[PDB]
Amino acid sequence: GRSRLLEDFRNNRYPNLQLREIAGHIMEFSQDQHGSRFIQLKLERATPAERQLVFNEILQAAYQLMVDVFGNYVIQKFFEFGSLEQKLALAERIRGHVLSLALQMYGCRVIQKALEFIPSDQQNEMVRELDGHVLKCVKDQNGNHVVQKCIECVQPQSLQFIIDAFKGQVFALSTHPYGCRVIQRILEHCLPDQTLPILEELHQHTEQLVQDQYGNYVIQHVLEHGRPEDKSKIVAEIRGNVLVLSQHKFASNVVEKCVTHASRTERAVLIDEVCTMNDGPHSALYTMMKDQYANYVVQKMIDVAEPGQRKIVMHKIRPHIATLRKYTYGKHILAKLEKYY
């Protein structure tokens, strides 16, 4: 199976092997773990000539290396460190196989690297090959990385077909493990005409989203990167429920982002909500203090409050200081207090 040259090479019988010396053997070395490493080592610091010898032997069977556990790296190097004519020629090799490669464990790495390095003409061609399979890729463990890369590298206007697919399914997709990632990429890179319809569906399901294992990240993302108007719509869903949400494993992360990225007014009102609100005998603030998740919200409130309001929070915390020691998470608030005293 292995040629004598590859066999002997593996037994380390060529300590000084040069790229030039494996002529006629590139495909086989490429498909071998050490040989492939060999080729990659030798490529970054190889003359364009030596690079072209290697290329002549991988072009025709390029696909075969794209979907091979060791061969895909050799192809990728050509997309990075290759030449503007070698990259184009490999794009040709991918043509008609974009879908199949984007779902492939190894090919999808080649599709990704190619999108970063090819011209927009070749990008827009790769993209269009996913026309009709947007959701299949978004949900696939390889494909969703390719769709993310498209959104990051390709002109937003050529991505309109992905948006079309997401319309009406934003809630479902935001609660999906890969879809929430793709949603986040769309908010970062897409045009208003595209992000707006998607933001409308997010606002419509904020309540459910903030408590969802994956949805909470999409809402956090908006708070961290969104327009003030989108932030405020979200902040308005949290107001009235600060105490409850801050005790939730997922939504508590969102409440924190609210506290952190809300406008001054919105922030003051959120912190005041639990300074003023009672939970039975004592403040909401106090119940939060003892909670495995809420204590983090309390601390974040202490962090970002305006100095005058920090005083208010301190005053509410002060009377419980001794009894805080008895509670597992209360203890952690004590730690935060040292800072401020």
Add this chain to the structure above:
RNA sequence: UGUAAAUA
């Protein structure tokens, strides 16, 4: 003291 992505 608390939550999410892929190859030797």
